Amino acid sequence: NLYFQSMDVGIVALEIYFPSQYVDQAELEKYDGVDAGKYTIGLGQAKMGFCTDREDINSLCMTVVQNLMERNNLSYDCIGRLEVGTETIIDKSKSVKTNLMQLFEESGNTDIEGIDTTNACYGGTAAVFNAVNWIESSSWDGRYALVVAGDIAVYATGNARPTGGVGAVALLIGPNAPLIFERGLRGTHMQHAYDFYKPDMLSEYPIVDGKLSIQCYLSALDRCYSVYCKKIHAQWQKEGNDKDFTLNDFGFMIFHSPYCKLVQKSLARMLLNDFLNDQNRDKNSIYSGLEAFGDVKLEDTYFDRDVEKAFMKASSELFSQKTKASLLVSNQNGNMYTSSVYGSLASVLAQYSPQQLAGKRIGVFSYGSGLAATLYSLKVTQDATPGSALDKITASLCDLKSRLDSRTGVAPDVFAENMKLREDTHHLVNYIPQGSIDSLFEGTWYLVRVDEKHRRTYARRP
Amino acid sequence: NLYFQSMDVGIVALEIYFPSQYVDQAELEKYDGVDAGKYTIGLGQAKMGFCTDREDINSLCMTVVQNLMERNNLSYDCIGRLEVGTETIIDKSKSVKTNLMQLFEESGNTDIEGIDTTNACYGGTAAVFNAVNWIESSSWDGRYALVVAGDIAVYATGNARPTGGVGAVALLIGPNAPLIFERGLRGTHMQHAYDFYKPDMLSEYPIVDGKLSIQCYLSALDRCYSVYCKKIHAQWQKEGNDKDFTLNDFGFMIFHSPYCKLVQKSLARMLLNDFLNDQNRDKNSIYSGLEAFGDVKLEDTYFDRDVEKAFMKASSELFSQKTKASLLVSNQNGNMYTSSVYGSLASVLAQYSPQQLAGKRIGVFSYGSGLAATLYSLKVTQDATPGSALDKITASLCDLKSRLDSRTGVAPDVFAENMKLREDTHHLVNYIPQGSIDSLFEGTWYLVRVDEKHRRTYARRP
Numbered sequence A, B: 001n002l003y004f005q006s007m008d009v010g011i012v013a014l015e016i017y018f019p020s021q022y023v024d025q026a027e028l029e030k031y032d033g034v035d036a037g038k039y040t041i042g043l044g045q046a047k048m049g050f051c052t053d054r055e056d057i058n059s060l061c062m063t064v065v066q067n068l069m070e071r072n073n074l075s076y077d078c079i080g081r082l083e084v085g086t087e088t089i090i091d092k093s094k095s096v097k098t099n100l101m102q103l104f105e106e107s108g109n110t111d112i113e114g115i116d117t118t119n120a121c122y123g124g125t126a127a128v129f130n131a132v133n134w135i136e137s138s139s140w141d142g143r144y145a146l147v148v149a150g151d152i153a154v155y156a157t158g159n160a161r162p163t164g165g166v167g168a169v170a171l172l173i174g175p176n177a178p179l180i181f182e183r184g185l186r187g188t189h190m191q192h193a194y195d196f197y198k199p200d201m202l203s204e205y206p207i208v209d210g211k212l213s214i215q216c217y218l219s220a221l222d223r224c225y226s227v228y229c230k231k232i233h234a235q236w237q238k239e240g241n242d243k244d245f246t247l248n249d250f251g252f253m254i255f256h257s258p259y260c261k262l263v264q265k266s267l268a269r270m271l272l273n274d275f276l277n278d279q280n281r282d283k284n285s286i287y288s289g290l291e292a293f294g295d296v297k298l299e300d301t302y303f304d305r306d307v308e309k310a311f312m313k314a315s316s317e318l319f320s321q322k323t324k325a326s327l328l329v330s331n332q333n334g335n336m337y338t339s340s341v342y343g344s345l346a347s348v349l350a351q352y353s354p355q356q357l358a359g360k361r362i363g364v365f366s367y368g369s370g371l372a373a374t375l376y377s378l379k380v381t382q383d384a385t386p387g388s389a390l391d392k393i394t395a396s397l398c399d400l401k402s403r404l405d406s407r408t409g410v411a412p413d414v415f416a417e418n419m420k421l422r423e424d425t426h427h428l429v430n431y432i433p434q435g436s437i438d439s440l441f442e443g444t445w446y447l448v449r450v451d452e453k454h455r456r457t458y459a460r461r462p
């Protein structure tokens, strides 16, 4: 109670990994023969990262883990919990976490709690919560928790294909952190839904109910925001503060980003929530011109274009200040599934100084289809001095745009053939990848071979 | 540290579910045309539970959860964490947890942390630890944690098939419990191994390296017990107690049970550890006659039959007192994968009075191939009085043997055809199970249909 208060448990370090090639969305429009703007404006997407046959879920996760450890000058004996959130499943029993133990062998540190945890795009967040809970528990042994969220997002040909991507994020979690989980403020919602699911074991691709997935994302947002607000209101009331939480109480607001347009719609949806919750709508200058919508219900408006147009316009400045910068990775790389929202976090840390971040609340909406969601928040430390934790974490990401721009664009036809071959190779054993090793970023782990018994071997590109 | 001391976090209720049919191992021997005793003595197995087409991982988990909630007169509003451990994967994205939310819709309690967590036979224990950590964290909100471990264990034709099984266990976890997690005593070991894994997406069956699987189990046991002993020694020493931990410090010792014989070997393996760790072996009467093995090394004796024979004989009384009773569910139902060790816990609770359990330490070895393992312990309350929580939890399981005996034996050829049809139905969509609803135990959830879009619908047998 005062024990938890001392700890300031949070994110101490954040490492992001994405492959060295992408397909350009304007080029993909031409290739797919669609009208100009359908992807770049309609979806709001510029470039989509993809993998050659040299990278898989294990190599992505090994890559981001080792890059974090080296960047941060960490011994492998300083990790007490290691866990993977993913929905890229290449083995139904053997966890990615057990594969990652290869990296820990030389240290002899094998007493490391955690395995893998999966529900669509939400597994990273699940692992984060497990890590925080563990640090705060009787079982914490003074060591860091390490969370890895990683995924390869690929869709069948059609209108979902432009919304894939690939990436991994590693989060080092411990006490006295610069980005502190705001205690007791997890607004969670889970529900039995078939919006997006992967029951077809013969294919890498999901079954997607596109329209239902949008409705589920938005209804989950409504519910999570309401639970989050109820929880903060109760804390505030104890402290003698009877005000209502609104978007202005977030300094930044980040989202799981399937594509940028939905995120812009989602911030507008949060404003609509604020609007409906304020009994003094018609006397607040923030809501000027929205009087025609005073009586609408959330459940009736998931696809109401009038409400949408009005609230996107009314939230444009809030979107620019709180959310637009967070979309760097999404716009330039696509949907990284479990790591997407953490890519949005990385994007904020990459583009704002410690002084611009100090003391701010970062709202985090994490969604996974099926469905599981939580809106939670982080509080940034007030220490923005040089050499501070906040300075180190921002300095660790300030080259993010430059890293993204160092990738190579690949023509849509070449990308398309990569996808086709990936399908064809999906169940294959006794094979050796043919993709370039040299084109991988420095320090990237890659697949060497899959043997006749499905066992995989990895090596590190120097 | 006084915050965690007050809590006495532990298991407050334990529900087990198994299907209503099994195949008899003596009949299976005759069917497979093997020598009499191969299964019943060699593996130590009497009966193996199996499912008709009416049950799947979702239905098993729904069944055990709702049975627990009803037995215990619990509101669905009193659950704050719900998580599933399993390795029975019928969807690569959509968690069993999200399916379970069907049961919580009526109450409106959707703010429930947790999803699914997987590594082979270990996922149940991972979820247990997540639940305990959560209760002890800043995020606990006063509600119970509920953990569900469930699986369908099936092997291809051959020497592994008699070691399958099926079942689920739900554990209700909260403060001031009758079975208390002994704090700070998790002896964990994880390692990158290919002993048993499920990379073949076209088949329900695992790739098993049988010999490697036994070696990995035993080496993991050695390491886990060593870490466990190191941790408890430090704890005792801070309290003023300098004694070495031995098997006599466990009142009961329970194990993940792939088959009973390996559990018997495993207790013997633990006594071999005690033997080698004891500097006065030759003066202690339990080790009398074992002087020839004084200089052996653990890593050289995984399949040494002389060591095995000697330590099996020497540990026979310890086995009878601490472990034999725990194998009721394993012997009568087979390997339940993630729930196997919790079935062994259930078996101890089913067969011992509160007075016989009171104050005792229950050692718990949980293993999952790949591999992840932990040896931990529970402490039973000293309160064995009439109407006590210990009275309550034992009373909830004392009909376990009669429940097992109420099942129907099915002939091996019928069992074989069930398995064959299961393989053939594995990827099928747009189908309606043909198995009997009336033969299911009262209150069992079952599969109604899998539609053309792979969506599954369930109903409950009254």
Ligand SMILES: CC(C)(COP(=O)(O)OP(=O)(O)OC[C@H]1O[C@@H](n2cnc3c(N)ncnc32)[C@H](O)[C@@H]1OP(=O)(O)O)[C@@H](O)C(=O)NCCC(=O)NCCS
Pocket (backbone or CB within 6 Å): A035, A036, A037, A038, A039, A041, A042, A043, A159, A160, A161, A163, A196, A208, A209, A210, A211, A213, A214, A217, A258, A259, A261, A262, A369
């Ligand atoms: C998201 C998804 C459903 C969209 O597919 P779609 O709706 O068939 O694609 P459409 O092209 O019809 O419409 C998408 C946008 O492009 C706009 N658009 C279409 N052509 C355009 C053009 N030439 N220029 C500019 N915009 C254009 C549409 O108006 C729409 O935007 P709006 O809602 O702001 O008006 C599909 O990508 C998908 O299923 N993705 C995977 C699941 C997912 O990401 N779900 C999100 C919730 S998790």
Ligand SMILES: CC(C)(COP(=O)(O)OP(=O)(O)OC[C@H]1O[C@@H](n2cnc3c(N)ncnc32)[C@H](O)[C@@H]1OP(=O)(O)O)[C@@H](O)C(=O)NCCC(=O)NCCS
Pocket (backbone or CB within 6 Å): B035, B036, B037, B038, B039, B041, B042, B043, B159, B160, B161, B163, B196, B208, B209, B210, B211, B213, B214, B217, B258, B259, B261, B262, B369
């Ligand atoms: C466990 C497993 C490896 C055993 O298969 P197997 O070794 O081919 O079966 P075997 O018959 O050779 O040996 C099993 C036992 O039966 C004994 N046995 C064989 N015939 C017998 C008979 N007619 N009467 C009595 N015992 C007999 C063997 O001696 C052996 O026991 P022992 O080690 O105490 O001497 C196999 O069932 C398997 O792969 N299971 C799945 C993996 C698993 O559960 N692993 C455990 C670790 S997780």
